[PDB]
mmCIF file of all heavy atoms in Angstrom:
data_model
loop_
_atom_site.group_PDB
_atom_site.id
_atom_site.type_symbol
_atom_site.label_atom_id
_atom_site.label_comp_id
_atom_site.label_asym_id
_atom_site.label_seq_id
_atom_site.Cartn_x
_atom_site.Cartn_y
_atom_site.Cartn_z
ATOM 1 N N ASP A 113 135.090 97.125 100.841
ATOM 2 C CA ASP A 113 134.238 98.076 100.245
ATOM 3 C C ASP A 113 132.988 98.414 101.069
ATOM 4 O O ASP A 113 132.526 99.605 101.083
ATOM 5 C CB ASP A 113 133.888 97.786 98.807
ATOM 6 C CG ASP A 113 132.996 96.584 98.549
ATOM 7 O OD1 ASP A 113 132.858 95.753 99.440
ATOM 8 O OD2 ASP A 113 132.538 96.530 97.351
ATOM 9 N N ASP A 114 132.463 97.424 101.800
ATOM 10 C CA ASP A 114 131.223 97.663 102.469
ATOM 11 C C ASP A 114 131.452 98.265 103.849
ATOM 12 O O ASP A 114 130.447 98.574 104.550
ATOM 13 C CB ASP A 114 130.443 96.327 102.534
ATOM 14 C CG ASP A 114 131.188 95.170 103.273
ATOM 15 O OD1 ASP A 114 132.348 95.050 103.306
ATOM 16 O OD2 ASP A 114 130.386 94.353 103.833
ATOM 17 N N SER A 115 132.732 98.482 104.235
ATOM 18 C CA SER A 115 133.061 99.263 105.422
ATOM 19 C C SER A 115 133.708 100.642 105.021
ATOM 20 O O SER A 115 134.234 101.356 105.835
ATOM 21 C CB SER A 115 134.090 98.529 106.280
ATOM 22 O OG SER A 115 133.476 97.423 106.961
ATOM 23 N N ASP A 116 133.611 101.029 103.775
ATOM 24 C CA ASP A 116 134.321 102.209 103.297
ATOM 25 C C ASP A 116 133.445 103.459 103.399
ATOM 26 O O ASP A 116 133.936 104.594 103.236
ATOM 27 C CB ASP A 116 134.737 102.086 101.857
ATOM 28 C CG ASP A 116 135.729 103.151 101.411
ATOM 29 O OD1 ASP A 116 136.691 103.292 102.156
ATOM 30 O OD2 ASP A 116 135.598 103.705 100.342
ATOM 31 N N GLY A 117 132.072 103.298 103.587
ATOM 32 C CA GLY A 117 131.246 104.341 103.763
ATOM 33 C C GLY A 117 130.825 104.952 102.420
ATOM 34 O O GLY A 117 130.983 106.138 102.206
ATOM 35 N N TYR A 118 130.357 104.082 101.522
ATOM 36 C CA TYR A 118 129.899 104.471 100.167
ATOM 37 C C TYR A 118 128.808 105.504 100.408
ATOM 38 O O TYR A 118 128.051 105.332 101.365
ATOM 39 C CB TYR A 118 129.422 103.215 99.461
ATOM 40 C CG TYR A 118 129.128 103.338 98.064
ATOM 41 C CD1 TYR A 118 130.209 103.371 97.124
ATOM 42 C CD2 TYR A 118 127.840 103.363 97.547
ATOM 43 C CE1 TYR A 118 129.888 103.543 95.786
ATOM 44 C CE2 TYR A 118 127.537 103.542 96.214
ATOM 45 C CZ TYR A 118 128.600 103.548 95.294
ATOM 46 O OH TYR A 118 128.357 103.692 93.998
ATOM 47 N N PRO A 119 128.648 106.457 99.521
ATOM 48 C CA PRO A 119 127.684 107.519 99.770
ATOM 49 C C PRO A 119 126.256 106.975 99.850
ATOM 50 O O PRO A 119 125.351 107.614 100.495
ATOM 51 C CB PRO A 119 127.793 108.409 98.580
ATOM 52 C CG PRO A 119 129.143 108.191 98.059
ATOM 53 C CD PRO A 119 129.489 106.744 98.352
ATOM 54 N N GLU A 120 126.025 105.892 99.176
ATOM 55 C CA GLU A 120 124.643 105.374 99.135
ATOM 56 C C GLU A 120 124.546 104.157 100.082
ATOM 57 O O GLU A 120 123.597 103.411 100.014
ATOM 58 C CB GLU A 120 124.275 104.956 97.729
ATOM 59 C CG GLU A 120 123.964 106.149 96.859
ATOM 60 C CD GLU A 120 123.794 105.668 95.416
ATOM 61 O OE1 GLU A 120 124.277 104.609 94.954
ATOM 62 O OE2 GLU A 120 123.190 106.445 94.657
ATOM 63 N N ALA A 121 125.511 103.971 100.977
ATOM 64 C CA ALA A 121 125.361 102.999 102.078
ATOM 65 C C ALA A 121 124.952 103.751 103.363
ATOM 66 O O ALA A 121 125.290 103.227 104.506
ATOM 67 C CB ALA A 121 126.580 102.236 102.263
ATOM 68 N N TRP A 122 124.275 104.846 103.274
ATOM 69 C CA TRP A 122 123.765 105.651 104.373
ATOM 70 C C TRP A 122 122.746 104.967 105.218
ATOM 71 O O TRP A 122 122.184 103.966 104.826
ATOM 72 C CB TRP A 122 123.175 106.969 103.929
ATOM 73 C CG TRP A 122 122.091 106.844 102.823
ATOM 74 C CD1 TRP A 122 122.180 107.145 101.500
ATOM 75 C CD2 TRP A 122 120.692 106.576 103.073
ATOM 76 N NE1 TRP A 122 120.923 106.992 100.871
ATOM 77 C CE2 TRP A 122 120.050 106.683 101.853
ATOM 78 C CE3 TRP A 122 119.963 106.174 104.243
ATOM 79 C CZ2 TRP A 122 118.658 106.341 101.642
ATOM 80 C CZ3 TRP A 122 118.503 105.894 104.048
ATOM 81 C CH2 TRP A 122 117.915 106.002 102.755
ATOM 82 N N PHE A 123 122.530 105.539 106.384
ATOM 83 C CA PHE A 123 121.549 105.008 107.326
ATOM 84 C C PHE A 123 121.001 106.212 108.130
ATOM 85 O O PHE A 123 121.732 107.185 108.346
ATOM 86 C CB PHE A 123 122.141 103.989 108.294
ATOM 87 C CG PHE A 123 123.421 104.372 108.955
ATOM 88 C CD1 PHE A 123 123.487 105.050 110.174
ATOM 89 C CD2 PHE A 123 124.688 104.096 108.324
ATOM 90 C CE1 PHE A 123 124.670 105.410 110.778
ATOM 91 C CE2 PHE A 123 125.869 104.427 108.980
ATOM 92 C CZ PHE A 123 125.892 105.061 110.165
ATOM 93 N N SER A 124 119.783 106.149 108.406
ATOM 94 C CA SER A 124 119.062 107.089 109.309
ATOM 95 C C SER A 124 119.240 106.607 110.731
ATOM 96 O O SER A 124 119.953 105.596 110.931
ATOM 97 C CB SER A 124 117.622 107.211 108.941
ATOM 98 O OG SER A 124 116.947 105.960 109.051
ATOM 99 N N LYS A 125 118.644 107.313 111.636
ATOM 100 C CA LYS A 125 118.657 106.977 113.051
ATOM 101 C C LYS A 125 118.349 105.520 113.297
ATOM 102 O O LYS A 125 117.383 104.984 112.749
ATOM 103 C CB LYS A 125 117.629 107.891 113.806
ATOM 104 C CG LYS A 125 117.439 107.521 115.311
ATOM 105 C CD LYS A 125 117.095 108.738 116.181
ATOM 106 C CE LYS A 125 116.170 109.796 115.648
ATOM 107 N NZ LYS A 125 116.096 111.038 116.455
ATOM 108 N N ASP A 126 119.121 104.970 114.248
ATOM 109 C CA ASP A 126 119.104 103.470 114.595
ATOM 110 C C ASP A 126 119.024 102.594 113.371
ATOM 111 O O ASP A 126 118.465 101.489 113.476
ATOM 112 C CB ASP A 126 117.955 103.180 115.582
ATOM 113 C CG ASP A 126 117.869 104.176 116.752
ATOM 114 O OD1 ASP A 126 118.881 104.495 117.320
ATOM 115 O OD2 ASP A 126 116.762 104.565 117.073
ATOM 116 N N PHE A 127 119.543 103.002 112.227
ATOM 117 C CA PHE A 127 119.469 102.140 110.991
ATOM 118 C C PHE A 127 118.016 101.802 110.517
ATOM 119 O O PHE A 127 117.815 100.768 109.821
ATOM 120 C CB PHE A 127 120.291 100.803 111.249
ATOM 121 C CG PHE A 127 121.621 100.988 111.816
ATOM 122 C CD1 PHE A 127 121.932 100.633 113.132
ATOM 123 C CD2 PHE A 127 122.748 101.451 110.978
ATOM 124 C CE1 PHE A 127 123.263 100.729 113.610
ATOM 125 C CE2 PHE A 127 123.981 101.576 111.471
ATOM 126 C CZ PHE A 127 124.285 101.205 112.803
ATOM 127 N N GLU A 128 117.085 102.590 110.872
ATOM 128 C CA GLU A 128 115.719 102.339 110.571
ATOM 129 C C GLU A 128 115.576 102.200 109.037
ATOM 130 O O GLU A 128 115.027 101.200 108.602
ATOM 131 C CB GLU A 128 114.779 103.455 111.076
ATOM 132 C CG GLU A 128 113.269 103.216 110.926
ATOM 133 C CD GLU A 128 112.423 104.047 111.904
ATOM 134 O OE1 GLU A 128 112.783 104.123 113.105
ATOM 135 O OE2 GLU A 128 111.325 104.559 111.462
ATOM 136 N N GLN A 129 116.041 103.144 108.326
ATOM 137 C CA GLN A 129 116.164 103.018 106.872
ATOM 138 C C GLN A 129 117.601 103.019 106.392
ATOM 139 O O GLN A 129 118.475 103.752 106.967
ATOM 140 C CB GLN A 129 115.395 104.134 106.185
ATOM 141 C CG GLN A 129 113.975 104.132 106.544
ATOM 142 C CD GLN A 129 113.257 105.350 106.056
ATOM 143 O OE1 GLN A 129 113.222 106.353 106.778
ATOM 144 N NE2 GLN A 129 112.745 105.343 104.772
ATOM 145 N N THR A 130 117.909 102.345 105.347
ATOM 146 C CA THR A 130 119.274 102.220 104.823
ATOM 147 C C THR A 130 119.307 102.424 103.338
ATOM 148 O O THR A 130 118.451 101.950 102.654
ATOM 149 C CB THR A 130 119.914 100.885 105.298
ATOM 150 O OG1 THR A 130 119.139 99.784 104.729
ATOM 151 C CG2 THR A 130 119.942 100.824 106.729
ATOM 152 N N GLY A 131 120.365 103.040 102.802
ATOM 153 C CA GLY A 131 120.494 103.255 101.389
ATOM 154 C C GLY A 131 120.687 101.990 100.659
ATOM 155 O O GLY A 131 120.936 100.991 101.268
ATOM 156 N N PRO A 132 120.649 102.030 99.291
ATOM 157 C CA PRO A 132 120.593 100.794 98.579
ATOM 158 C C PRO A 132 121.936 100.035 98.618
ATOM 159 O O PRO A 132 121.908 98.835 98.341
ATOM 160 C CB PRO A 132 120.288 101.174 97.116
ATOM 161 C CG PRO A 132 120.327 102.752 97.050
ATOM 162 C CD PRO A 132 120.423 103.234 98.539
ATOM 163 N N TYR A 133 123.040 100.703 98.935
ATOM 164 C CA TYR A 133 124.269 99.973 99.021
ATOM 165 C C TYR A 133 124.711 99.569 100.463
ATOM 166 O O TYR A 133 125.803 99.100 100.703
ATOM 167 C CB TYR A 133 125.372 100.748 98.311
ATOM 168 C CG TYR A 133 125.313 100.641 96.837
ATOM 169 C CD1 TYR A 133 124.523 101.562 96.075
ATOM 170 C CD2 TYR A 133 126.113 99.789 96.140
ATOM 171 C CE1 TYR A 133 124.512 101.480 94.669
ATOM 172 C CE2 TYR A 133 126.097 99.678 94.761
ATOM 173 C CZ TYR A 133 125.320 100.518 94.058
ATOM 174 O OH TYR A 133 125.374 100.412 92.719
ATOM 175 N N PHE A 134 123.905 99.723 101.420
ATOM 176 C CA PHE A 134 124.134 99.315 102.860
ATOM 177 C C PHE A 134 124.210 97.816 102.950
ATOM 178 O O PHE A 134 123.324 97.104 102.448
ATOM 179 C CB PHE A 134 122.987 99.827 103.742
ATOM 180 C CG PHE A 134 123.164 99.494 105.233
ATOM 181 C CD1 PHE A 134 123.560 100.509 106.132
ATOM 182 C CD2 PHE A 134 122.859 98.227 105.656
ATOM 183 C CE1 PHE A 134 123.690 100.187 107.486
ATOM 184 C CE2 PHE A 134 122.881 97.921 107.026
ATOM 185 C CZ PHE A 134 123.371 98.911 107.910
ATOM 186 N N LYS A 135 125.239 97.359 103.710
ATOM 187 C CA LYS A 135 125.404 95.976 103.968
ATOM 188 C C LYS A 135 125.514 95.615 105.466
ATOM 189 O O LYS A 135 125.140 94.581 105.854
ATOM 190 C CB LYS A 135 126.559 95.351 103.319
ATOM 191 C CG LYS A 135 126.719 95.577 101.832
ATOM 192 C CD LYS A 135 126.276 94.346 101.114
ATOM 193 C CE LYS A 135 126.251 94.534 99.558
ATOM 194 N NZ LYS A 135 127.701 94.224 99.101
ATOM 195 N N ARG A 136 126.178 96.502 106.243
ATOM 196 C CA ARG A 136 126.557 96.177 107.642
ATOM 197 C C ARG A 136 126.520 97.419 108.576
ATOM 198 O O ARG A 136 126.722 98.587 108.152
ATOM 199 C CB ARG A 136 127.961 95.675 107.622
ATOM 200 C CG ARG A 136 128.895 96.517 106.813
ATOM 201 C CD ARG A 136 130.382 96.071 107.119
ATOM 202 N NE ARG A 136 130.652 94.712 106.725
ATOM 203 C CZ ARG A 136 131.213 93.837 107.502
ATOM 204 N NH1 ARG A 136 131.593 94.124 108.754
ATOM 205 N NH2 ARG A 136 131.526 92.661 107.026
ATOM 206 N N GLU A 137 126.261 97.124 109.818
ATOM 207 C CA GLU A 137 126.292 98.211 110.856
ATOM 208 C C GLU A 137 127.695 98.414 111.431
ATOM 209 O O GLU A 137 128.032 99.501 111.812
ATOM 210 C CB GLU A 137 125.308 97.875 111.970
ATOM 211 C CG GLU A 137 123.843 97.776 111.595
ATOM 212 C CD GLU A 137 122.891 97.301 112.757
ATOM 213 O OE1 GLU A 137 123.294 97.145 113.943
ATOM 214 O OE2 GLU A 137 121.701 97.073 112.481
ATOM 215 N N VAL A 138 128.493 97.353 111.541
ATOM 216 C CA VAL A 138 129.734 97.385 112.266
ATOM 217 C C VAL A 138 130.768 97.362 111.147
ATOM 218 O O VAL A 138 130.983 96.407 110.526
ATOM 219 C CB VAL A 138 129.905 96.208 113.199
ATOM 220 C CG1 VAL A 138 131.209 96.311 113.964
ATOM 221 C CG2 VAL A 138 128.748 96.128 114.191
ATOM 222 N N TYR A 139 131.492 98.488 111.023
ATOM 223 C CA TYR A 139 132.545 98.663 109.959
ATOM 224 C C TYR A 139 133.833 97.880 110.462
ATOM 225 O O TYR A 139 134.093 97.845 111.655
ATOM 226 C CB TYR A 139 132.751 100.134 109.678
ATOM 227 C CG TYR A 139 131.872 100.639 108.601
ATOM 228 C CD1 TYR A 139 130.639 99.978 108.307
ATOM 229 C CD2 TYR A 139 132.123 101.791 107.985
ATOM 230 C CE1 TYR A 139 129.820 100.519 107.370
ATOM 231 C CE2 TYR A 139 131.324 102.272 106.947
ATOM 232 C CZ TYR A 139 130.152 101.583 106.642
ATOM 233 O OH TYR A 139 129.407 102.022 105.636
ATOM 234 N N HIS A 140 134.578 97.411 109.474
ATOM 235 C CA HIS A 140 135.782 96.604 109.695
ATOM 236 C C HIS A 140 136.982 97.251 109.032
ATOM 237 O O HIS A 140 137.037 97.387 107.761
ATOM 238 C CB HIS A 140 135.516 95.234 109.006
ATOM 239 C CG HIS A 140 136.645 94.191 109.202
ATOM 240 N ND1 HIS A 140 137.443 94.116 110.367
ATOM 241 C CD2 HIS A 140 136.976 93.177 108.444
ATOM 242 C CE1 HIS A 140 138.264 93.130 110.242
ATOM 243 N NE2 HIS A 140 138.027 92.532 109.074
ATOM 244 N N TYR A 141 137.987 97.676 109.828
ATOM 245 C CA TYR A 141 139.225 98.290 109.401
ATOM 246 C C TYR A 141 140.364 97.318 109.764
ATOM 247 O O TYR A 141 140.806 97.282 110.995
ATOM 248 C CB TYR A 141 139.355 99.610 110.096
ATOM 249 C CG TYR A 141 138.253 100.629 109.909
ATOM 250 C CD1 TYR A 141 137.508 101.074 110.939
ATOM 251 C CD2 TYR A 141 137.898 100.992 108.567
ATOM 252 C CE1 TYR A 141 136.397 101.958 110.733
ATOM 253 C CE2 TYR A 141 136.815 101.869 108.389
ATOM 254 C CZ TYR A 141 136.056 102.344 109.458
ATOM 255 O OH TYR A 141 135.037 103.217 109.309
ATOM 256 N N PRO A 142 140.915 96.549 108.843
ATOM 257 C CA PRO A 142 142.005 95.607 109.243
ATOM 258 C C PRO A 142 143.307 96.279 109.311
ATOM 259 O O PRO A 142 144.260 95.775 109.837
ATOM 260 C CB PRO A 142 142.036 94.548 108.030
ATOM 261 C CG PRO A 142 140.691 94.715 107.385
ATOM 262 C CD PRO A 142 140.436 96.239 107.530
ATOM 263 N N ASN A 143 143.387 97.563 108.742
ATOM 264 C CA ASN A 143 144.530 98.401 108.996
ATOM 265 C C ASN A 143 145.806 97.895 108.397
ATOM 266 O O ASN A 143 146.868 98.080 109.004
ATOM 267 C CB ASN A 143 144.760 98.787 110.443
ATOM 268 C CG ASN A 143 143.581 99.533 111.083
ATOM 269 O OD1 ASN A 143 143.223 100.644 110.574
ATOM 270 N ND2 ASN A 143 143.020 98.978 112.047
ATOM 271 N N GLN A 144 145.802 97.219 107.238
ATOM 272 C CA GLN A 144 146.940 96.520 106.647
ATOM 273 C C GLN A 144 147.541 97.486 105.707
ATOM 274 O O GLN A 144 147.379 97.380 104.486
ATOM 275 C CB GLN A 144 146.457 95.233 106.064
ATOM 276 C CG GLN A 144 146.406 94.114 107.092
ATOM 277 C CD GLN A 144 145.712 92.808 106.746
ATOM 278 O OE1 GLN A 144 145.144 92.104 107.649
ATOM 279 N NE2 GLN A 144 145.643 92.469 105.511
ATOM 280 N N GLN A 145 148.141 98.488 106.278
ATOM 281 C CA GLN A 145 148.640 99.658 105.567
ATOM 282 C C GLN A 145 149.750 100.397 106.244
ATOM 283 O O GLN A 145 149.980 100.177 107.484
ATOM 284 C CB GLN A 145 147.515 100.578 105.174
ATOM 285 C CG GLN A 145 146.886 101.313 106.365
ATOM 286 C CD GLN A 145 145.574 102.043 105.987
ATOM 287 O OE1 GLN A 145 145.607 103.170 105.424
ATOM 288 N NE2 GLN A 145 144.457 101.359 106.295
ATOM 289 N N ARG A 146 150.385 101.324 105.592
ATOM 290 C CA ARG A 146 151.425 102.094 106.256
ATOM 291 C C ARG A 146 150.926 102.919 107.379
ATOM 292 O O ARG A 146 149.816 103.443 107.238
ATOM 293 C CB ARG A 146 152.030 103.018 105.229
ATOM 294 C CG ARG A 146 152.785 102.293 104.215
ATOM 295 C CD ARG A 146 153.477 103.266 103.255
ATOM 296 N NE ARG A 146 154.096 102.439 102.211
ATOM 297 C CZ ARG A 146 153.498 102.078 101.092
ATOM 298 N NH1 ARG A 146 152.336 102.518 100.644
ATOM 299 N NH2 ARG A 146 154.277 101.313 100.289
#
C-alpha cells in the first residue's frame, strides 16, 4: 500500500514536504502478478 501512490502520500520537490500518508521515497513493486 505504501508503494501504491496514495493521493495523500504526495511529495513536493526533493521530498521537502510530504502528505500525511507518505511513508517512503523508494517504491517497491514485487510484481507477483500476471
Side-chain angles (χ1 to χ4, degrees):
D113 69 343
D114 62 328
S115 289
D116 195 50
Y118 191 74
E120 285 171 337
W122 53 257
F123 48 92
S124 57
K125 175 146 41 189
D126 312 318
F127 310 108
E128 187 157 318
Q129 300 171 270
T130 60
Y133 284 86
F134 181 104
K135 307 260 177 86
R136 47 170 61 231
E137 298 174 7
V138 183
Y139 272 21
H140 186 29
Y141 299 121
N143 297 303
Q144 276 166 207
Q145 68 191 279
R146 289 185 186 91

